[PDB]
Amino acid sequence: ATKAVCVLKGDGPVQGIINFEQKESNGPVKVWGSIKGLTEGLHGFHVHEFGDNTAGCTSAGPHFNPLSRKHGGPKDEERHVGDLGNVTADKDGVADVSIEDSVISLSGDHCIIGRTLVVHEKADDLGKGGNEESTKTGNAGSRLACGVIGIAQ
Amino acid sequence: ATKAVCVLKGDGPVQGIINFEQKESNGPVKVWGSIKGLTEGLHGFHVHEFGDNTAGCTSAGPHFNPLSRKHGGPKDEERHVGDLGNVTADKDGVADVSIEDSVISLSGDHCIIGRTLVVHEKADDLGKGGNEESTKTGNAGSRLACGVIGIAQ
Ligand SMILES: *Sc1ccccc1C(=O)Nc1ccccc1
Ligand SMILES: *Sc1ccccc1C(=O)Nc1ccccc1
Ligand SMILES: [Zn+2]
Ligand SMILES: [Zn+2]
Ligand SMILES: [Zn+2]
Ligand SMILES: [Zn+2]
């Protein structure tokens, strides 16, 4: 199995820890952890292309999209590799993350190691927002916290 | 060419930006950037195995050593892949980093993307300290700052 991890930090209250595990080469990736300091509701959750946090989350670039598709939700055929949908924060501002995804990987060209995980201010509309931006970014607003996805033991 | 980047953060503030560039997979990696907030002199400079900064630099694990060798300096045949020697801070506490290394890579099993770059409190003795620890860690003392090495544009 391969494992990865990411510490989410930003300029404000949002912080988190996210773990990734992939038992088989080309098998699904389990994503789990916790994010706090969020407003209650849905928050866009994306792998962005660059693991460049030199200017914070703004240096991370666009959604990780090695297969040149439009933006969608994780259960859509038409999605970016980095489109992990939304995490859900409760009224305490805590998101307990538990995702299984078949498109991201921890090896090869769908590999997300060395890229940036970002949690957003607003909900990702999953390409169903009714404007042009919806099928590019999902209209998820500001980047509240991010980190580089690293190899874990 | 492949490019990578790392933001080093640690108390001081010890803060740095380190860039990596490799023109072909068979080529050396150019490592350049700046680290500030250091004491004047030599500071050990290592790629540690895990890109895990969940508990700060301590979670990064040992020196990246995929070939099961002893610790050395960068110009030694007997070294860890992660053994980048020392950076040098001036009397303003600034290390201007300029290294070319032939052993680290931005691809393959010597790949350092997704691992942790660490700058240390003391000088790396490069395996020439005269105790057992010298040929494992180089006696470079505490981890001052670190970050996960990410893919850059
Ligand atoms: S997982 C990963 C993360 C960042 C850069 C490269 C990789 C990677 O595993 N790439 C591979 C491509 C082709 C064959 C093996 C590995
Ligand atoms: S470059 C990289 C970054 C993060 C995880 C894995 C890799 C990688 O490509 N590793 C390889 C090991 C052995 C053979 C090919 C690739
Ligand atoms: Zn995003
Ligand atoms: Zn997207
Ligand atoms: Zn070290
Ligand atoms: Zn070493």
Numbering used by the authors:
A (entry chain A), B (entry chain F): 1 to 153
The authors write:
Ebselen and ebsulphur were found to form a covalent bond with SOD1 Cys111 while derivatives with a benzyl substitution on the benzoisoselenazole or benzoisothiazolone nitrogen did not, possibly due to altered reactivity or steric hindrance in the dimer groove. The 1.3 and 1.5 Å resolution structures of wild-type, zinc metalated, disulphide intact SOD1 bound to ebsulphur and ebselen, respectively, allowed for the unambiguous placement of the compounds in the SOD1 dimer groove. They show the formation of a selenylsulphide or mixed disulphide 2.0 Å covalent bond, respectively, between ligand and Cys111 created by nucleophilic attack of the free Cys111 sulphydryl at the electrophilic Se–N and S–N centres contained within each respective heterocycle. Electron density is evident for both ligands except for a small part of one of the ebsulphur phenyl rings which projects into the surrounding solvent. This indicates some rotational freedom in this group. No ligand conjugation was observed at Cys6 and the intramolecular disulphide bond between Cys57 and Cys146 remains intact, as does the conformation of loop VI. Ebselen and ebsulphur form tight interactions within the SOD1 dimer groove, and a hydrogen bond is formed between the ligand carbonyl and a highly coordinated water molecule situated, on average, 2.55 Å away. The effect is mediated by π–π stacking between ebselen or ebsulphur aromatic rings and increases the dimer binding energy by exclusion of water.
A subset of ALS is caused by mutations to the gene encoding superoxide dismutase-1 (SOD1). While zinc binding and an intra-subunit disulphide are not directly involved in catalysis, they stabilize the molecule’s tertiary and quaternary structure. ALS-related mutations reduce the ability of SOD1 to fold, bind necessary metal cofactors and predispose it to disulphide reduction, which in turn prevents its normal dimerization. Dimerization, disulphide bond formation and metal ion acquisition are the canonical SOD1 PTM steps en route to forming a stable and active enzyme.
